[model samples]
Every structure is written in structure tokens, then in C-alpha cells.
Target chain A: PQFSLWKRPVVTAYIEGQPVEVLLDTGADDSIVAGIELGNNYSPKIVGGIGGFINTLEYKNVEIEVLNKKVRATIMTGDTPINIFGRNILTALGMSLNL
Target chain B: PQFSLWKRPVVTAYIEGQPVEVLLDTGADDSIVAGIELGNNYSPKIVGGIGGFINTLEYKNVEIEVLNKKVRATIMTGDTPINIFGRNILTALGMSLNL
Candidate 1:
């Protein structure tokens, strides 16, 4: 089987009144937000997960309303240069894209 | 304090013989490697640091020989979905970037 290149839609997220743009990447298995983008407002009060391996950060029960679609997803936070929308968010919205 | 936007050069690192491209982001205070990109070769033996908060994962004693310079650094691991080259590595190599 051959795999094709896919580009998911980009969406904006607002946290503490800051707008963050994220690319919806279905290739990713989990939802992710950027640590830098979170800025000083990052709070430990937010619930997250640790992966099977040591030190992987995953966020749980994240709420996002995008493209007129609202979803509650488990999000993982990382220090990536880019924020990504992953399968968890896509699955909840019943959405997919083909490249 | 006033802040400025900057873009840094990207470099690649090989871990367990796997090639990974990482962006050099000075705005970020910590070094990171991607979870998905690491694939199955992710090892827990790598040392890291924990932030003041509950679940922030920081890496420690990371060795990277980059841009003809060799240095040992503390790297923090996260699931950011993107790998980044942080200020620690740049400071060791005396490198900087401007947007």
C-alpha cells in the first residue's frame, strides 16, 4: 500500500485571550499544544498524562471549539516549534482530510 | 522588559542511528526531542529536569556535538510533536539568529 501526503486545516485557539494558530495534523496520534505559545499563563492546574515511556506530557479533557465544531479532547503539551491538532481532536469532531 | 521575535538556524541530530531535524529556537529556554519522531527508539535512560510545576519534563546531561562545537547540555523531553534546539545549545556554541 502506498501512503499519500496530507495537509490538515489550520485553526486558531484562544487561551487567556491569546490567539494561537495550530495545524490540524491527522498523522499525529495525539493532540498537542505548544509550550512557548502558552507563555507565562501555563498552569500546572491543567491535567495531563505521562506516556508509557519516561517524561512524555499529555493533556486530558481539553476543550476546543473549531470551525463551528466543538470538542473535548485529551491534549498533550510539548515544546515543539509548531502547535498541532491531532487525532484525538479530529476523532471527536468526526473529521478527516485527504491529500 | 521588551521582547523581540527571532528565527534560528535548524540542525539535525542522530539518535540510535535515526536522523532527526530540529529547529533552533532561542525563545525557548529548554531543549527537546520529539516523541513521534523518536519512534520506538525512545529510551528512558536519558536524564532530564522537572519544572517548578507538576508535569513539565526537562532533560538533563544531554550531549550534542553541533556546528563544529561539542558540549554537554541538560535536555527536557516533551511531546511537542516538533523537536527544537534551545538556548542552552546555542549558548555553548556561541550562535544566535535574528528574524
Candidate 2:
């Protein structure tokens, strides 16, 4: 049998009334959302970039549902290929994992 | 033998004259950096956050060195727990990988 490469679960989220799916990567340090679908619902602050580093905007605290449980988190936003489940949300749930 | 979980190389970056090491996760779509170190270097534009989403600032094009090679790229900025090696820098080098 082939070993499963992924140990974490994939999560689904509804953003701006749209449903989006993302992987829960504990390896990630911050939470992220998809860039293409983000639309005008967000206004990002510009920092500088070099060597894979970016600084962005701060948003209001909001609610998130994970594993059929709802939790509140202080989210830091960014644009990426896919949405990320990171420390901001994970720490809120008192959950930690190795990925 | 225990298999190495990481396939890509870890890269080091100098930010604001400080050196930091970060993993190059091909699974990530965008590049990122450490929030604590980002400091006042960036002025972010706050959007809104809810459901695992936060938005921030955009930065200008910059030069980056990777694998001892320097390349030019357009960088989007965001705050993260650690620095990320994402598509912006990877695509600029015409490099692709599966993590």
C-alpha cells in the first residue's frame, strides 16, 4: 500500500459567500487566502518584497469554523495560490501538529 | 532508514541588514517573511478579516538572490510567521517543483 503523503485534513471555507477549499498545513506560519478569487472584498497594504518576504495589511477579527467547530482568530492576510491554515487560526484552537 | 521529509533546499535571506533562514516550500503559492522582523519597513493597508482571511499591502519589484543566482521579480507583500519561498521568485527563475 502506498503511504499517504499528507497527514493533515483539507478544510472548506466560505469567503464572501463563496466556498473555498484549503489544506491545513501546520508547516505554514500564517493564514492565507486565494489571490484570484479574493476580489475587492479586501484591500491589502503594500510593503516591500525580496527573498520571499512580504508585509501586508491587518484586518478585523473574525470567526472561523474548523472540524465542525467555530473559533475566533486575529487574521493576517495575503494573496497566494491557495488558502492556508496556519498559526493564527490553529493557535486559537489550541491545536498543534507536525506536517 | 528515515526518509528526509523535505526535498527542496532551505534558503537564507537578509532583511533590513539581518540574516534569516527559511524553508523553500513549493507547496506555497506566494512568498512571505517574518512579521516580527518586518517592522516599520512596510506600511500596510488594512482590509477585512473573517474566516481565515486577512489582506495587506503590496510592494514594488525587487532583486533576490537564490542558489547563488540573483533574479528580478515583482513581489506582493504580506506578514507571516516566517519567510516563504513561493511562486513569485520561483516563476521568475522559470523553476517549478513538487513538494
Candidate 3:
């Protein structure tokens, strides 16, 4: 397959059965939802980004489906630059690196 | 609320008992190390990054430690902007996205 250093993979996933594109960011300890706001159920935590650290909300047990695999994920919802898919769900679904 | 869109996270990891800082990239399918050359034990593959795609070598069974956890990882080696730790390691370490 053809790939690029600048071309990061933004895969399609089903969140609550709706399709959404998410950035796969291993650099992040948690996945974040950008452009979407959640309720007070999300708790705040400090996350370190490329520039510095910022407060993010932890939203746990989020259900998602990707690449024919389904999962319950813990997502951080915030005003992030992009929506990310962290290792939590990818690991559970058995996504391996260089496999 | 202080998190900026441009900030990304890079963390410290140990490779073969030596400390090395790596970019935590979930957007990548395989982790790539910059400035290191691997032998034919690695196979050729294409990788897509935040910038674009490039030809990379698949290096298997790389041992690493991140956040006090250790695992053998499958990595991609190439000329990259930075050294990255893929999901293969983070997933195994029980590194949660938003615990």
C-alpha cells in the first residue's frame, strides 16, 4: 500500500452505530472527541500534547466499531484539533503494528 | 481548556535497556525510528504519517519500555521526523486512552 509521512490515517468508525472519522494518535494517552461536546459525566485530566499539557475530560466506556471489530472505549472529549483513536480500543480489537 | 490544537505528545521509552524518547503516534500503523539503520531482518513497507507516506522497513520483535511497562514490539524503521512508539507496545503495556 502507498503511505506518506504527512498522511496520517483517519479511519472510519461507528460510534453508537454512526460513522465518524477519528485520528489514530498513539502519542496521546487517551482518545479525544473534537467538535463535539459531552455532558458533565466527563472528568478533567491534564494531557501532554506536542506543545504542552492541557486539561481534558475523561469519558469512559464509549462503544465504537472499526474494521469489522467492535469495542467499548474510554474517550476524552474536548476541543481538540482532531478526534483521536487511542490504543485502548485498538489494542482490545487486536490491531497490531507491522503485522 | 488550555490544550492547544498544535501540541502533540512525545514520551520517554527504553529500548534494549537504553532510554530513548519516542513520539506516541496512534495515527501510524507501525512505529518508525529515525536515524537508525536496520538489516534485512526488516522487510520493506509503506507508512503513512501526519505529513504523508514513505517507504519503511518493518522491524519485528523490538523490546521497549514506556511508562514503567515493557513489551516486545513490531516497528517500522525509516527516515522519519521522529522516533515513534506504536500501538504494538502501548497496547501491550495496558496503557489506557483515558483511564
Candidate 4:
């Protein structure tokens, strides 16, 4: 079959009550979103991206859902090229790539 | 395939009935392979990548078996970001974006 990479695993997800397409990448280390409205209980961190390192904000006790499964987990904040359901977010929903 | 997006439902597929681990991505419209042994009838095409557009090889009547089902289809050869099974392959294997 004709296959291409443009068709990433873009699945529907909810963040801060808004629906977005999340690119599921097992190669990635954590979940990334273009941006998010976070709370005071957050932290700053550095991460590696497609090219290089970038600074990011991380949040805790964030609520989200995938395929209708609700979860509460430690989420990080970042300016991603696109929204990503990173390993951390997947783990929050009792999910992982190794399955 | 007890699926996990992270787990990505990576399944055993066969290129010409040879065993290969394929990541099932319903979200992707096409399939991708790392480098492949080609026949004379394949063509060359330009397709978009996750980052940008890249050049690749297209092969026709390629023999691939997924889930023990056989299919004859076209394939795009690329410097794979990774080996993946896209939507076209699932269709060829009597599969689709939806189960």
C-alpha cells in the first residue's frame, strides 16, 4: 500500500475543555502542546525538540481525556510545533507505547 | 493487536511474506518503509514529511502480508524517520482507518 509519514497519529484529545489533534509519537519523551492555560502550581524546564533544546513550562494535576478516558496527571507546558500526546500524558491515562 | 497508541499496535507484517514489525497508524493515509529491495516497475515521487517535503521511491505490486493476509500494493521508499504501516496498507490487508 502507498504509505507516507504526513499521516501522523493525530487523535482527538481534550485540554482545558478544548478539543485538539494530538500527534502520538513514541519517539518523543513527553507530551507537548502548542500552548495551554495553566495554574500557579507549575515549573520551568528544558527539553529537546526536533532540532534543538527549548525552555518549557510544566504543570501538575492537569486533567485530560483521550478516546473518552479521563485522567489526572502531572502535565508539562510547552510551545510545541504541534500538539503531542507524549509518553507522559499517555502514561497518565494508563497508556504507553510498548503496548 | 491489543492496542496502545504509544504501543502503536506494532504488528508483525511481511514484505514479500518476510517478517517485519509494522506500527499500525490509522491516522496516516499512506505507508512507509525504511529502504527496500526494489523491482524494475517502481517510480519516484515527492511527498510531504512531518517536518517538510522529502523525495522518495515508489514501488508497485510490492508483496506485503499483514496479520497473515496478503496484498499487492505500491510503496514509497524513503530515509524513513521510521518504518511504519500507513492507511493504504491496512486497506490492502482488508483493513481501514476504522475497524
Best by lDDT: 3
Model 4 misses residue B5 by how many Å?
A: 5.2
* Candidate 1 local lDDT, B1-99, one digit each (tens): 111212123467654344678765433455677562323333343422222222335545556665545677766566654576655665665553211
TM-score of chain B of each: 0.60, 0.59, 0.75, 0.81
Top-scoring candidate (DockQ): 4
Relative to the true structure, candidate 2 has a C-alpha RMSD (angstroms) of 12.2
Tell me the tens digit of each residue's lDDT in model 3 across A1-99: 212224455778877666778876645556777655556787787775433455778887878887777788887766565678766665666543331
lDDT of 1 by residue, A1-99 (tens): 111222224568653344678765433455556653432323343322223222336545556776655666666666544576655665566553311
**TM-score-based ranking:** 4, 3, 2, 1
After superposition, the stretches of candidate 2 with alpha carbons farther than 4 Å from their true spots are: A1-4, A7-9, A15-18, A35-51, B1-99
Candidate 3 chain A weakest lDDT stretch, 10 residues: A1-10
Measured with C-alpha atoms, the lDDT of residue B46 in candidate 3 is: 79
Fraction of native contacts under 8 Å reproduced by each candidate: 0.00, 0.00, 0.14, 0.09
Over B10-89, each residue of candidate 4 has an lDDT whose tens digit, in order, gives 67777874676766654345667775767667678776533445677888778887675778877777766556776567
Candidate 3 local Cα displacement, residue B98, angstroms: 23
- List, residue by residue over A1-99, the lDDT tens digit for candidate 4: 221333555778887787778875544556666666776877888876323465778877677877778877666666656666655665555543221
Query: How close is every model to the real structure, measured as TM-score?
Result: 0.36, 0.39, 0.51, 0.63
Q: In model 3 chain B, where is the ten-residue run with the lowest total lDDT?
A: B1-10
- Between prediction 2 and prediction 3, the one with superior TM-score is 3
- Rank by DockQ, highest first: 4, 3, 2, 1
* DockQ measured for candidate 3: 0.10
User: Could you tell me the TM-score of candidate 2?
Assistant: 0.39
DockQ of candidate model 2: 0.04
User: What RMSD does model 1 have?
Assistant: 14.4
